[PDB]
């Protein structure tokens, strides 16, 4: 037998042998644009971190309500992020709990009308403004003294629903003693949280620090998960950052938190590599080894053709 063709293949002995019609197995092209997964339409956090979304950054109000999604797309060095400098405790654990939740539901727990002897509207800062005017996160309340008094807070919540909740609160790390006196009457302060599995006690820290975002102060937040028929108990004497909105869980599935800077275009994609949509039937790909959904395996070699013919 003999024919004419211009393919090549690599064997154990030689590396530049030319062969007849072969069958390529590695897929190298891609769409290069983020699209929708199986009809379900993704969530694009344009310039916003996960902490900024879950806390309610003033310049992130485009995501106050979001339908069902498939994955969370994020951008490196996100400008907005968090404003009043601080930290989220176990922040990497929270982002591991995500990519397992596909649907959320914002629910109103103890409202702005449940604080009679506590001011709730004069808490703002220049670190997070809105159209010039100062502002503050929207899923969390900063409590300040009112008529020269900060009475002790004793509140509780019973999860009557058949779903679980994610509650976020915080503490204020004042800079000096004069600042703490100005905000809250009591110098020595603490916060206690008690559940059926949790036990926490904390106190503020006063010291001298540097200037970041023009603010000489810090904040620290914390998170937990509640259970049906369970209860959560809050108690504090000062430096309390009370919550207003909670988060429900109604669906659990497969997701992925990526980091990319590609634009959004209308499609219907099946496997979404971080840098471009891919749709093919070959059993090997080469683009990027962090995929969502079903799609072939990842190899590094630049040529995986396997011969089928003779000569």
């Amino acid at each position, epitope marked *: 037998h003999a024919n004419n063709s211009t393919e090549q293949v690599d064997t154990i002995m030689e590396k530049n042998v030319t062969v007849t019609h072969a069958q390529d197995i590695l897929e190298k092209t891609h769409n290069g644009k983020l699209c929708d997964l199986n009809g379900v*339409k993704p*969530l*694009i956090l344009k310039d916003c971190s996960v902490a900024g979304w879950l806390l309610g950054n003033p310049m992130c*109000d*485009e*995501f*106050i*309500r*979001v*339908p069902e999604w498939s994955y969370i797309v994020e951008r490196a060095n996100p400008a907005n992020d968090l404003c009043f400098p601080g930290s989220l405790n176990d922040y990497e654990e929270l982002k591991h709990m995500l990519s397992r939740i596909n649907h959320f539901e*914002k*629910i*109103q727990i103890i409202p702005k*009308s449940s604080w009679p002897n506590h001011e709730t509207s004069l808490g703002v800062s220049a670190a997070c403004p*809105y*159209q010039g005017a100062p502002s503050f996160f*929207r899923n969390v309340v900063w409590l300040i003294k009112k008529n020269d008094a900060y009475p002790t807070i004793k509140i509780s919540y019973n999860n009557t629903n058949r779903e679980d909740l994610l509650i976020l609160w915080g503490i204020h790390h004042s800079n000096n003693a004069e600042e703490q006196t100005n905000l809250y009457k009591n110098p020595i302060t603490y916060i206690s949280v008690g559940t059926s599995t949790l036990n926490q006690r904390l106190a503020p820290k006063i010291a001298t620090r540097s200037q970041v975002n023009g603010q000489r102060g810090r904040m620290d937040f914390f998170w937990t998960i509640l259970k049906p028929d369970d209860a959560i108990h809050f108690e504090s004497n000062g430096n309390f950052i009370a919550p207003e909105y909670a988060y429900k869980i109604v669906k659990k599935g497969d997701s992925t938190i990526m980091k990319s800077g590609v634009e959004y275009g*209308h499609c219907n994609t099946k496997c979404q590599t971080p840098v471009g949509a891919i749709n093919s039937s070959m059993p090997f790909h080469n683009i990027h080894p962090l995929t969502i959904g079903e799609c072939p395996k990842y190899v590094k070699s630049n040529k995986l053709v396997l011969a089928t013919g003779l000569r």
Partner: antibody
Amino acid sequence: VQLVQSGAEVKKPGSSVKVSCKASGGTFSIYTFTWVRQAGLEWMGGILPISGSAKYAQKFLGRVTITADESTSTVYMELSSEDTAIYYCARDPYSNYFYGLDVWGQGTTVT
Amino acid sequence: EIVLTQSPVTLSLSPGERATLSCRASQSVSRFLAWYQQKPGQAPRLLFYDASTRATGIPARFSGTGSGTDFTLTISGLEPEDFAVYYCQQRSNWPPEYSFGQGTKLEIK
């Protein structure tokens, strides 16, 4: 969430009428409300109640005044002279994407 | 600002055939439009949305596709209840901005 408006009234032209957009049955504080008039269809703008602002219509950018109260589920409008007809209300869900004004009102006539 | 012009307002028809509408675009609006159907004496009803797909309660008789610069609404078989005025809508920017069309009439012969 069911929507019912104020009613009807007749006043001299050039004055203002406060038409309401009362609703009930959910979390009102994160919903988008607009205004549609019929003196085809026209638009004025509304308010997201959690932000405390408004996006007035460029056709009459200084005409209307819109405000919302997040303790009673009611939206106001201040129309401060051929306006002799009805004014509706509407609602579209979600923020980052647009589906459509699913829940529509019934009407309010002012002559 | 965005301006929209629809198909000619007067369009008489008789049952037993199809009807299709149109609505211009001007500057691009992508896929953020909505449809409607207003009968005399009440508020309209969302027929199709996402400038393409349909919702619940709308009969399968109604259809219509086109997002980029074409806008259509095609019926399979004319029924005696398909008689009203239909309109066009869009939305722009993050802070909600809107604008409506003029309207079209389908009338019996």
